[PDB]
């Protein structure tokens, strides 16, 4: 499947190269990364875009100064998430109590 297995190799390897070259960085020049990986600026930024969409690396592109701001994604507060779910659950519970009270009163 050199018709397309070569393409998958190209893609996964390019991903690996980008993650490697960018891990030792913070907000950094897109053109500089392009020179590092010896690849067109548009294509490198695009691939970064897809990686970000798929949540591969916690980074955000910027087409202003033309850079890529990486960061550390903190854990989502599962405490708040569970709290929200519990609030909905007690909405149901108190609704049941309300119906019961109206039935019996």
């Amino acid at each position: 499947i050199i018709s397309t297995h070569l393409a998958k190799l190209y893609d996964n390897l390019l991903e690996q190269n980008l993650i490697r070259v960018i891990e030792p960085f913070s907000r950094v020049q897109i053109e500089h990364i392009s020179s590092l990986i010896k690849l067109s600026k548009a294509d490198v930024e695009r691939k970064l875009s897809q990686m970000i969409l798929d949540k591969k690396f916690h980074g955000i592109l910027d087409q202003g100064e033309g850079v890529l701001i990486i960061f550390d994604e903190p854990p989502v507060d599962k405490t708040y998430e569970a709290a929200l779910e519990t609030i909905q659950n007690m909405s149901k519970v108190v609704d049941s109590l309300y119906n019961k009270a109206k039935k019996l009163t």
Partner: protein, 379 residues
């Protein structure tokens, strides 16, 4: 299952009703040929009354004479079976006459006939099939009350017991209903569930069915689920091989190739408007798709130039500015604009901030309930 009725008839009806499509001579010819051949006597009468067509006189006269002869012989056969035959075949006779009432376009009469047939009948399969006929008529005539009640009866029968074939048929019916009523979430769910076992061929062509599945899925799926279901969907790709346009639409979106996404969206908008079922959702769907395109584009940027928006979408700058401003006002985007310096920033809230907002809202609601109940009781 049989075309009782043939919903493409309703599609043609809505087309003719459409303003510029009122002059659809070819559609006119197709519809009147179908009317003559299937003996749409009352249906044609209502059609010509609604669209001001010259009421057919001589051809309609022979048509109604044939209709009356058929009705007479059918009712006489019913009487024969009633007087001599047993319940098993009397039920078949009444069911057949109700089907012919559908084949003419006697709406209330067919309703009553199928109702009585179901009342007498004992076979669960027959009950579900009669309900299917009722649902098909109900969708044909957008009587949402009828569709919902028939669906209720069908489900109840199913929980009593059912066969997976009619489960799939009911799922397709329900998906068509959700589409009709703008419930694209459940619509896409059921459509992708049934794509494995599409069987209600009578309702519509399989190709158009998958077209609808693709539309609803794009609308109501996140990018991941879209990947695993539509792009990697086995048949949802095989049939797409045949499909020469929706393929481009879906992929343009997925790999983010833009302005081709917009050309595809415009096309599908015209076809969506032409379609009878989606007509009272095409505006909303087009807006939602435009919003999804913008959101996907923005999600991978913090400060992206408005000019580059313009080129990437292959459009102007003022048009993009207007659309962005409108949807920002709508508040569906976490984005703000600078016009003095053409740029767009993303004000994406912290997970913490957003969740705290939701907690505040939900706490307010539930506390309101709590004080309300505590009060109603303590006093």
């Amino acid at each position: 299952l049989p075309k009782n009725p043939d919903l493409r008839i309703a599609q043609l009806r809505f087309l003719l009703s459409l303003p510029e499509h009122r002059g659809d001579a070819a559609v006119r010819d197709e519809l009147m040929a179908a009317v003559r051949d299937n003996n749409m006597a009352p249906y044609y009468e209502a059609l010509c009354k609604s669209l001001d067509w010259q009421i057919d006189v001589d051809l309609l006269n022979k048509m109604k004479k044939a209709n009356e002869d058929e009705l007479k012989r059918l009712d006489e056969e019913l009487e024969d079976a009633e007087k001599n035959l047993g319940e098993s075949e009397i039920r078949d006779a009444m069911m057949a006459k109700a089907e012919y009432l559908c084949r003419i376009g006697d709406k209330e009469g067919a309703l009553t006939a199928f109702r009585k047939t179901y009342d007498k009948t004992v076979a669960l399969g027959h009950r579900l099939d009669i309900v299917f006929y009722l649902l098909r008529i109900g969708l044909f005539y957008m009587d949402n009350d009828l569709i919902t009640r028939n669906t209720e009866k069908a489900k109840s029968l199913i929980e009593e017991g059912g066969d997976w074939d009619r489960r799939n048929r009911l799922k397709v019916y329900q998906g068509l209903y959700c589409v009709a009523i703008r419930d694209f979430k459940q619509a896409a769910e059921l459509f992708l569930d049934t794509v494995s076992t599409f069987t209600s061929y009578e309702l519509m062509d399989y190709k158009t069915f998958v077209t609808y599945t693709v539309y609803v899925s794009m609308i109501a799926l996140e990018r991941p689920d879209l990947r695993e279901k539509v792009i990697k969907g086995a048949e949802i790709l095989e049939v797409l091989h045949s499909l020469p346009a929706v393929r481009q639409y879906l992929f343009s979106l997925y790999e983010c190739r833009y302005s081709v996404f917009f050309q595809s969206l415009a096309v599908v908008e015209q076809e969506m408007k032409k379609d009878w079922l989606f007509a009272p959702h095409y505006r909303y769907y087009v807006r939602e798709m435009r919003i999804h395109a913008y959101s996907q584009l923005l999600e991978s940027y913090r400060s992206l130039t408005l000019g580059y928006m313009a080129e990437a979408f292959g459009v102007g700058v003022e048009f993009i500015d207007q659309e962005l401003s409108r949807f920002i006002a709508a508040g569906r985007l976490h984005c703000k604009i600078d016009k003095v310096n053409e740029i767009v920033e993303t004000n994406r809230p912290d997970s913490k901030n957003w969740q705290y907002q939701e907690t505040i809202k939900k706490g307010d609601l539930l506390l309101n309930r709590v004080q309300k109940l505590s009060r109603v009781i303590n006093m």
